[PDB]
Design an enzyme around this catalytic site. Sequence first.
Site, PDB file in Angstrom:
ATOM      1  N   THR A  44       0.615  -1.636   0.057  1.00  0.00           N
ATOM      2  CA  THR A  44       0.051   0.101   0.158  1.00  0.00           C
ATOM      3  C   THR A  44       1.019   0.895   0.185  1.00  0.00           C
ATOM      4  O   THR A  44       1.347   1.578   1.019  1.00  0.00           O
ATOM      5  CB  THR A  44      -1.117   0.133   0.746  1.00  0.00           C
ATOM      6  OG1 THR A  44      -1.781  -1.149   0.946  1.00  0.00           O
ATOM      7  CG2 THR A  44      -1.891   1.300   1.513  1.00  0.00           C
ATOM      8  N   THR A  45       0.561   1.974  -1.026  1.00  0.00           N
ATOM      9  CA  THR A  45       1.369   3.546  -0.621  1.00  0.00           C
ATOM     10  C   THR A  45       0.837   4.366  -1.672  1.00  0.00           C
ATOM     11  O   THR A  45       0.793   4.269  -2.993  1.00  0.00           O
ATOM     12  CB  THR A  45       2.743   2.684  -1.971  1.00  0.00           C
ATOM     13  OG1 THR A  45       3.709   2.043  -1.582  1.00  0.00           O
ATOM     14  CG2 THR A  45       3.656   4.449  -2.058  1.00  0.00           C
TER      15      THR A  45
ATOM     16  N   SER B 239       4.254  -4.930  -0.780  1.00  0.00           N
ATOM     17  CA  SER B 239       2.906  -4.467   0.112  1.00  0.00           C
ATOM     18  C   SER B 239       2.406  -3.490  -0.968  1.00  0.00           C
ATOM     19  O   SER B 239       1.627  -3.371  -0.630  1.00  0.00           O
ATOM     20  CB  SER B 239       3.358  -3.716   0.985  1.00  0.00           C
ATOM     21  OG  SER B 239       3.299  -4.552   3.304  1.00  0.00           O
ATOM     22  N   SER B 240       2.912  -3.088  -1.320  1.00  0.00           N
ATOM     23  CA  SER B 240       2.783  -2.941  -2.931  1.00  0.00           C
ATOM     24  C   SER B 240       2.993  -3.366  -4.167  1.00  0.00           C
ATOM     25  O   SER B 240       4.271  -3.289  -4.580  1.00  0.00           O
ATOM     26  CB  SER B 240       2.964  -1.585  -3.279  1.00  0.00           C
ATOM     27  OG  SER B 240       2.878  -0.612  -1.471  1.00  0.00           O
TER      28      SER B 240
ATOM     29  N   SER C 279       2.673   2.107   3.662  1.00  0.00           N
ATOM     30  CA  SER C 279       3.527   1.366   4.086  1.00  0.00           C
ATOM     31  C   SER C 279       4.874   1.115   2.676  1.00  0.00           C
ATOM     32  O   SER C 279       5.988   1.129   3.460  1.00  0.00           O
ATOM     33  CB  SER C 279       3.494  -0.461   4.236  1.00  0.00           C
ATOM     34  OG  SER C 279       3.268  -1.386   2.461  1.00  0.00           O
TER      35      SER C 279
END
EC number: 3.4.25.1
Lengths: 213, 216, 234, 240, 230, 239, 199, 232, 233
Positions: G1-2, G168-169, G129
């Site tokens: 997640t970004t 996470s991305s 993150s």
Amino acid sequence: RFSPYVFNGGTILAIAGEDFAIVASDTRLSEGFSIHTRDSPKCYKLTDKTVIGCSGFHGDCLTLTKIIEARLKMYKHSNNKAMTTGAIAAMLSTILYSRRFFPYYVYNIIGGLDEEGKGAVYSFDPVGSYQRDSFKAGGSASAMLQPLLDNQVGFKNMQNVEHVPLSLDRAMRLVKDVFISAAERDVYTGDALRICIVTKEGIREETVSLRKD
Amino acid sequence: TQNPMVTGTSVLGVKFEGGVVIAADMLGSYGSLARFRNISRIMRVNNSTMLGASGDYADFQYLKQVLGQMVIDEELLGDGHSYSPRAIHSWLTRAMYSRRSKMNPLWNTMVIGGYADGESFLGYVDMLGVAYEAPSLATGYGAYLAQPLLREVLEKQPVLSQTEARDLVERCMRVLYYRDARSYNRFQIATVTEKGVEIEGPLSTETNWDIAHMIS
Amino acid sequence: NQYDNDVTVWSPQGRIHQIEYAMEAVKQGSATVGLKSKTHAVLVALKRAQSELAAHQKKILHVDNHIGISIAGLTADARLLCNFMRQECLDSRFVFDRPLPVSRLVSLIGSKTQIPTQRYGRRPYGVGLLIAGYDDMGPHIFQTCPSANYFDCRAMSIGARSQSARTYLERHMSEFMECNLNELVKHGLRALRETLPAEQDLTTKNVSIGIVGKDLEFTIYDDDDVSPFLEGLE
Amino acid sequence: SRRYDSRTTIFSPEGRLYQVEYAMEAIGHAGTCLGILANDGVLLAAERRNIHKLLDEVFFSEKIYKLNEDMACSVAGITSDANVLTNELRLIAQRYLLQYQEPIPCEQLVTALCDIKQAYTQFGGKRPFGVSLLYIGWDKHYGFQLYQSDPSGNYGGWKATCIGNNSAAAVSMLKQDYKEGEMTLKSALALAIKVLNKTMDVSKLSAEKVEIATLTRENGKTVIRVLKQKEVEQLIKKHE
Amino acid sequence: RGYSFSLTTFSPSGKLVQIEYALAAVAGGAPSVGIKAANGVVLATEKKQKSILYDERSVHKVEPITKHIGLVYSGMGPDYRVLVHRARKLAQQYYLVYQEPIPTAQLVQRVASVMQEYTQSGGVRPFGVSLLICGWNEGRPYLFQSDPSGAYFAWKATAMGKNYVNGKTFLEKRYNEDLELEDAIHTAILTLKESFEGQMTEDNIEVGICNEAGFRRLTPTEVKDYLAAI
Amino acid sequence: GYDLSASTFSPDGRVFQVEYAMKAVENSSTAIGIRCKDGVVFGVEKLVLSKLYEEGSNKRLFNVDRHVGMAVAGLLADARSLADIAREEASNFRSNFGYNIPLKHLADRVAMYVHAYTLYSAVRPFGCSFMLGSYSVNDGAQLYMIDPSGVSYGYWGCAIGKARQAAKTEIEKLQMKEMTCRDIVKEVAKIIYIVHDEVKDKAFELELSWVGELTNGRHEIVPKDIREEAEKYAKESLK
Amino acid sequence: TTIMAVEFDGGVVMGSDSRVSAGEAVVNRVFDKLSPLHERIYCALSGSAADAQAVADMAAYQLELHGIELEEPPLVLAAANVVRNISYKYREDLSAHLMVAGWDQREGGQVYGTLGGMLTRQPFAIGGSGSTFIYGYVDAAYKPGMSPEECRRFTTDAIALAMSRDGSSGGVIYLVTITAAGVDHRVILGNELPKFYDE
Amino acid sequence: SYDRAITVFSPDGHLFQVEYAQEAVKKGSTAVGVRGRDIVVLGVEKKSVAKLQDERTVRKICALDDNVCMAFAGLTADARIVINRARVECQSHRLTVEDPVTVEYITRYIASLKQRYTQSNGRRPFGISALIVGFDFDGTPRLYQTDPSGTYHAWKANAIGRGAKSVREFLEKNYTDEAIETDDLTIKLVIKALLEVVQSGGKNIELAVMRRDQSLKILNPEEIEKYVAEIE
Amino acid sequence: DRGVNTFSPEGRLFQVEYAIEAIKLGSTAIGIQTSEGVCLAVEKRITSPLMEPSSIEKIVEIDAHIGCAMSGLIADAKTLIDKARVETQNHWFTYNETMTVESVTQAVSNLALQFGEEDADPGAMSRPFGVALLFGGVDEKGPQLFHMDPSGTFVQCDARAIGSASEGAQSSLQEVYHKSMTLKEAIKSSLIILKQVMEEKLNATNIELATVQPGQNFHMFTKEELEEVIKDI
């Protein structure tokens, strides 16, 4: 884990004579390994006859004294007379006990004059449990000042010594000399001394210097 | 608020003849990271009060909205009664304390300074309800590094002219930059006096590294 | 007849009859007169005696170190509202660590007594108060009424036949900023004695004096205590 | 506001709860209902007011409700209130069976309900239930039983009684024609059709203008049964 | 806060006068008719339609409560919307709790209870509607009539609203137990047609049917067809 | 009669309690405001009922928030209660939404509050009208006038109290769309000196306030010098 | 997640990756992290995706009531005060982070940061993150006064960098440009992400 | 909830609801008791003979505990409520004290209860007067009368219900230490009392009996009728 | 019909006026305050010889130093008595001292005008107490006799007559009382006035008598003591 109690040190002391009641405490307000302030006297003038000490977790000292004084003006409003030392003692027992399950962590020592003009000192513990003594120390340095006050005031373990009544001056030199005996050794004691004398004349205040290091 | 998410570093407080001056660098951290680099941690409450805070920053903004709301509700009356710094100090002591009593502690270590009636008040309130006045305060590691400097100088001079205080705060903040890991060369200095609350900043700290060439 | 049974019934003239009838209560109370000077806020009360053997009912009530009241009307209402006032002041000296300003106090009392004046089945407080209080703004003498409205007065007289005392107090109000304590209390006692029947007289018994000012916390003077201030009275 | 309060929970100048007695007028206008206590069983006989129209008769009976394994109740008057009372009695007896693991005796059940009707009659200002109830139920303590309760919350055990329209003539005929401890179930049927014949002024009695359900014992179990129409015609014809 | 005492008090004669009056209100309502066939139930109710401005397809008096239950009323409309939403609530609670379509006798017991609660609660008037609930399940038809007093009657065929007495006397001579569904609908529509006063159209009379396939409203086309042959 | 509570329409459909409460506002002393190019001004014919009262007793110009003023009338305690309700309103809006509440939404909320008491027998109407003033760079000056019925109307010039009609005929004499505050203050003064029936109910005070450009949107009572020059000119215009 | 936002003159630009992973295997490889709160106020979600969604919906509700009641488009400061209040009041129960951005007549483009329940306007307010890997890039490549295309290619570059390093991305990069004209929703497919030093 | 004030003063200082409740008692089935040397007898008039009636479930002389029983008169339902509350409270007393309740305890309890419903929102006063008779743990006999007003008293022998004026006149005339020297003179005292007011000497009240440290004893109507012929 | 909280056209609550009229029907009680202590005598007004004389107790104990006479609706005063008892004992528990008379009569006085019909979170009191109490006792301030009424006004009185024949009897109190009176003189005087006012012929049964002296606790005179004092008549 959030910890809601911290030991901010500072010792109090109280003595009862035939006509007075001294209360004294150091004003070092320590925590961990520092000195917050070298001035935070731990005696709080409650009335004209009652001088209450508080050591331990400084926050609960503030809250507890504030609650006490609020209760004194409640009493004075519903009864038209200030609380004696007896009533203040019992009421501070029910205040300190009504939080039996998350204590006020504050060693009180209420010294003052009962209605007979005679000394009286009610040493407490954090969960209530009071009593009337003739002398008492509390807080950080209670264990180094208590026995010497047994000796020069209770005259215990002596032989061929006249148990003379406790005179105001000799009680003074006992207070100052014992707080020096604590300042040499106790880490949390020092930086000042706030000696409040109680008599029928009112409350006279006396301070003393101590070791700063 | 059991855990701090965005904390600040040490705040400095120091009295002086006719007013109080505090400093608190504009950094807001998130762990070791220096995430927010332009947040102000010193509030103006009114003409005679100004507040600081280390620790958690979100709760600091809760106390901004609540506290400014109180002083605005009180200014609404226009009855001439305004909270002196002692009243605001005692109030934060009570709110912080009660929140502690519920085990929902505001993770702040605030330092309220003010100047009403020619008497420089300078309070302290940490998360657990500890409170007191003092001629020199420093929350966080400031109580370890800058605190000995301030009590040293005030020991040398308990009454300070305003500029001498300001240099003392600048030099303490120089130490905090050199040695405090959560610090940053960007701080505000707040001055409260007769005239009112003046917030200078962002300032910076000259730094010397001559020792860096001494190791050999 | 069909409009005077409830607090929540507007008459055709747009008047709440129960509230007016509530003010008739304070108009029947024993006369109490306050006033103030540049530095002092004085109260003066005639403590009614029901029977010769009975003692004059107390009209003054300690509220806090700097604020005192003087009820007149339904007494139990007066001790209720007094308990409220006391709880307010204690809460202020608890939280804010400073004495409650008086005007804010009488505002709280105003909003308090306003509530039943507008909700069905409640009744207006039939207690008409004078409040003396000293704070940073100088001494104060507030009047409150069953209608929940409060006043800020130079000098006001409530109770039965109080109109005479207000008449005298108009005759001499212009002098009150300069009067010292004793002269002030003399004015209060004279105006209060203007209310009673001619033959009957002020005595150490039926008078009470609660003074509060700059260098003096609020203090109430009882039957022997009004002796010092109870003299001359031409 | 006080203009609007009817004050249903106050005494009169002579000590008579106006709402309870007015309710007694309402049940006084209800359809007559009577049961008889015998040795070998108990029967209830209630004049129906679903008489006769395009009604469907989807139910098994009109004024007879089943309360537990071992009881039955007949209402009279306000139909809806009778519904609320019946549901409440079922709830009581089943709570007793939860909390004790046995059936509830009739006396305890009637007292539990009559405390409710009394409760409305005393405070709360609600109108009292205008619904009289006759109960029948067996219990291992006291045998077959008949309990009459009325809007005031008062109740009593009876050996045979009649509530509702012409209740006076009905109880009169029972006084003239009840043989204490010697009435059989069939003797009870015959007498009940006697009283209902004489009281119901609508004129020739039919199988449609009443219903009768009888309760007896069978093999350590209680049987609550309603009389089919053929048996009713048979018993009225026998009455002729 | 609201009035807590009952507004319906036993008159000194003991007959609840508010329920007499409420029944008079339903007696003035728009006429409705229901008849139970051998395989289903018909519901047809008169639209007291004012000016042609009305979007007649906007709201209906014969609302389904589930896939197998209907409702028609006679009297006060908004009160009826109250009882409809309450009924839908009840049938849905029953469907969650027991996982079965609610038997119509049950639903009429509960909704009858809710109609009763307001003859007794604090400061509320009784309803002003007399429901006709038709339902099918267990392979059997049901038709109940609930009144303001809360009591419900099981019917072969019934009528309510304006002129309900002449309606019922019209049904006594024209209902027969073996009447199939469509001829039932014919009999009901004739029943309303006795005292319609206004030349019925497919817009101003509604028709509902409940059979084994479920309950539903007949669209004004079909109702127009049944309005043929009369 | 038929008028024993607000929850009872007459045979003609008039909740007599609201109309009566309006007859309570109309017995009080007239107060006026005038919205103009740059703010709003308030005057208050505050009849002083005896020489004993302090200069400043029974103020009828409040501060419901720093960007909103409030002039009331009628039964005054009820006015104070609206002060508490409104103050709670603006405070709630600053805590929720983080900026000064638009006055329009504030008279919506308060208007619903007053209206909340004309539906029940359990409570009576507020027998008090009042005006709200505000200035902001985003919306300019605004003046709303709640009455006992709870209806909120925006006015260029308003008057509430006993001499409402004469005060209206006086307000229509103005081109208030083209005047600034420092000139409006005089004219409001002349209005209050004109509408006041002097020989009946003598001895009032003049208590003014504005909020606008010159006060940076901060509602504050008028400076005493400006009030006194204003009274001087208005009285001179009486002559 | 970004998720990332940027402030430029006419409005903002809210980039955001398009992966939501469950531990080490992804659940959704396309997920729009930009849910509208009004016509011109987007909130970039992060953290507990369920919690962030509930926060976005409640905030949209209050912002819509407040929106209609004033009859004027709600200022972004209002929106970030309601999302700030709902993120602060529940901070022990929501692991949410909502860089609420948008436009409004009274102030123009804004990007308020609301991590942990705080409120701080910022030029570029990156979160998520993967945001711990692009502080270097954004600090080295951010120059105030960016034209819109500079903002869009900029945030595309930055989130591209975060996507290459962070686990996470991943996925596509959504971009929306909020201005007085309206919202201009755009998508960056994996074949269009600007390639950087890959080794 | 209903919170109207039902019981309010009237323009003489009277509580009209209390006078009306006492009216309801004055139409109640007449009851009488007496306090003897080791026995306490209560008699409840006839009430409703009604040949179809059941005796057991229409009595007025319920048990409150092993040592406390009570008559009453008036709204019988209400008295059923008060009896129930008193029973639950007796057992709660045995839970919190281990000692059986004195007659003073339970009587002063019920007097408190009746006093509360004379003075609360939306509650009418009870229409019951209860002559609670019982034995303190020392065994002394106890007669306490409680009326709807809530005021209770010890009594030698007092009569409640309709015609309690004439019957109370009777015990005023005939209560002597010769009268209660023995059991049978006591019970012939009670029935000799009601016989002025009973419906022809009876069944047409049957009574009840309690002996020292002995649970409540009732009478069947035969032994009542022995005394009947013995007095008639 | 109107409410309980209505003010009349004169400015008094209706229920307090009608209640203070209701006290006028009660049996006359009288007590007198002296520097030796305070006595209390009240007419029982026995209604029938079948009654137990020790049943009517109109002079009950509130604590070791506070004797509470009453007159009026004797049922209502039970909540007052129990209220005062719980009060002084809680005061003893918390503050470790006996409770002053002014504190007790003030606390129990707080319940009079606590009545209404719309606030009513519980089923709280729906009318004013129809009780006129006369709390007597001694404290550090010494002997004091505080009248109280339904209106909640508690006033210090030297000697006061309350009840049916309180009018005349009170005239006897102002007639006979003087500050230097000795306590036995108080007992004799009060019994003289009651004998003046009572309808029935006086005896040691249809009255009671209690006093509270500086060292003596509250005490009710038994039959023999009452007779010994009535030998003077």
